[PDB]
Amino acid sequence: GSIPGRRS
Amino acid sequence: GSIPGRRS
Amino acid sequence: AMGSMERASLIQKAKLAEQAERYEDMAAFMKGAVEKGEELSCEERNLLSVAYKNVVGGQRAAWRVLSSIEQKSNGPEVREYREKVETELQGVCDTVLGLLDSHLIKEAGDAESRVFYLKMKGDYYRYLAEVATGDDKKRIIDSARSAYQEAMDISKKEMPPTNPIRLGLALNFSVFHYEIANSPEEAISLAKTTFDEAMADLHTLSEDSYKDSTLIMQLLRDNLTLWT
Amino acid sequence: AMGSMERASLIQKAKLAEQAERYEDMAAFMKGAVEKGEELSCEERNLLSVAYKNVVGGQRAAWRVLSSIEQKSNGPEVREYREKVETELQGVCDTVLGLLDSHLIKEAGDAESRVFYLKMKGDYYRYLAEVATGDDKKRIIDSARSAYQEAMDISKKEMPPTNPIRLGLALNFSVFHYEIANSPEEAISLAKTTFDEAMADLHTLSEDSYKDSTLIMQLLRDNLTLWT
Ligand SMILES: *Cc1ccc(S(=O)(=O)N2CCN(C)CC2)cc1
Ligand SMILES: *Cc1ccc(S(=O)(=O)N2CCN(C)CC2)cc1
Ligand SMILES: [Cl-]
Ligand SMILES: [Cl-]
């Protein structure tokens, strides 16, 4: 898995 | 709640 | 416009779009399929309904988030953005209502198709009513009520009390009464009578039909638990 | 084009769009904010990144569903629809890469901003590489590698080993090695060295920074567990 990066 | 109705 | 794509291809792509969770695409493919002018089968009606319930469901959830922030706030940005989402939602509801009026309802002669489309018409006027505030808000509510009432009258004459469309129609009309019409007693009475008449008819069903009907009965009971 | 909306209003609406889970809107507002021409603060970079990771994340998940159906199939519909989604995904990646080239990277002089944008550039070339099959697929992979490598070189010179951007860059570059470059040994060695050098630097951190760094370290360990 990469960084989800979906929430600030 | 109403019918979710989101999946066939 | 999907005018250059085959009807069967639009249907196939709507099923793929569902699997891919691309509900805007799914709705555009099913709109294209309706605009071919042929009546829809049971499965194709379900695809149309699922596509638009997902699209408008996302818009409604967003509108509620923004409306709540705006209520707490009382710059123009929150109101402006709530208005943008609201206009988009109204546009989708108007699109669905237009498909029903041109010409799905008038060509629906069997009770199962006619009830299905009139329930949709009540639902999409209900979503309009959730955001309405102006000169026509009473008329929007009455349009929802009238569509649901015609669907109810047909369903009680033509379908058994366990029919899943009849059950879902009664569920959603009860939500209309409770949430839109400020008639909680009517909502409770409709949900109770619907549940009890379905219970009494379960003995006639196969195992698979039993599962279909009892699933919706549970939604009726869940609302009754919350409302009483 | 968001040219008529104030920069501060675009930023405010991007935050509202996040709360409303309207990620396409969020991306359009942040694109508008970038196109105002001013550099972005740390928070504004995060908003830009979150918006586009959600948009392209949905496209990538859809592309994988359709690609899998298409592989099992081998009418034109599955391929046609996979191609449609692929083109849309490529368009979003090209949009992000265009913002980075015009002109976020060239104006990024601090290590924290420059590393952030170069990591984005590697990620969006990586998403292009996931769907690439033609004459330029090798060049796409090398563009991702080159961006990640420049980011790595800066991060090792200018940031502590626990810096969350440095950690996330190393995580994503290790995924690039494993998934795109067919270099699992390089992926494992990068993830291990990154984890160990971060562990040794945790003693320098406050409680809040410790939480930020250890969260990403856990993602490194999760990959190492899967890869070994
Ligand atoms: C309004 C409404 C929506 C969905 C149902 S159901 O989930 O029972 N079901 C959907 C699939 N089709 C084939 C049968 C009905 C019922 C009412
Ligand atoms: C590439 C990357 C994305 C996200 C992180 S983080 O979740 O640690 N974090 C996001 C919020 N900003 C303020 C700090 C970093 C790290 C790397
Ligand atoms: Cl007919
Ligand atoms: Cl600068």
The CA-atom distances, in angstroms, between D192 and each of D172, D173, D199 are 13, 13, 11
Q: What is the largest CA-CA distance in chain C?
A: 61
C-alpha C15, offset from chain centre: 19
Contact C108, C100 (CB under 8 A): no
Say if C2 falls within a structural domain. no
Say if C116 falls within a structural domain. yes
Burial class (CB in 10 A: 0-12, 13-18, 19+), D124: buried
Say if C106 falls within a structural domain. yes
Long-range contacts, D146-155 (Cβ 8 Å, 24+): D147/D118, D147/D119, D147/D121, D147/D122, D148/D118, D148/D119, D148/D122, D148/D172, D148/D173, D148/D176, D149/D173, D150/D118, D151/D114, D151/D115, D151/D118, D151/D119, D151/D122, D154/D111, D154/D114, D154/D115, D154/D118, D155/D111, D155/D115
Those chains having 3 or more beta-carbon pairs within 8 angstroms of chain A are: D
Contact C124, C60 (CB under 8 A): no
The CATH number that applies at residue D130 is 1.20.190.20
Tokens matching residue C202: 């379960």
State how far the Cα of D112 lies from the Cα of D42, in Å rounded to an integer: 8
CA distance B4 to chain C (A): 8
CA distance C23 to chain D (A): 11
Say if D2 falls within a structural domain. no
Range of the structural domain that residue D223 is part of: 7-228
Tokens matching residue D14: 């991007």
Experimental method of this PDB entry: X-ray
Q: Which of C126, C123, C133 is nearest to C70 (CA)?
A: C133
Closest atom of ligand 1 to C43 CA is 13
Say if C96 falls within a structural domain. yes
Amino acid at D34: V
State how far the Cα of D221 lies from the Cα of C114, in Å rounded to an integer: 57
State how far the Cα of D63 lies from the Cα of D61, in Å rounded to an integer: 5
| Chain A and chain D touch, per 3+ beta carbon pairs within 8 A | yes
State how far the Cα of C144 lies from the Cα of C137, in Å rounded to an integer: 11
> Is residue D15 within 8 angstroms of chain A, CB to CB?
yes
To 5 degrees, how large is the angle CA C12–CA C17–CA C22? 160
How many domains are there within chain D? 1
Say if D1 falls within a structural domain. no
Say if C189 falls within a structural domain. yes
Say if D35 falls within a structural domain. yes
State how far the Cα of C179 lies from the Cα of C181, in Å rounded to an integer: 6
End-to-end CA distance of chain D: 48
D15 with A8: Cβ contact below 8 A: yes
Contact D44, D13 (CB under 8 A): no
Q: Is C30 in the pocket of ligand 1 (CB under 6 A)?
A: no
Closest C-chain CA to D81: C13
Q: Which of D189, D199, D198 is nearest to D223 (CA)?
A: D189
Task: Give resolution, Å, one decimal.
Answer: 1.4
* Residue of D21, D81, D82, D86 to mutate for C, most C C-beta atoms under 10 A: D81
* Residue of C22, C53, C169 to mutate for B, most B C-beta atoms under 10 A: C53
Contact partners, residue D202, CB within 8 Å, separation at least 6: D162, D210, D213, D214
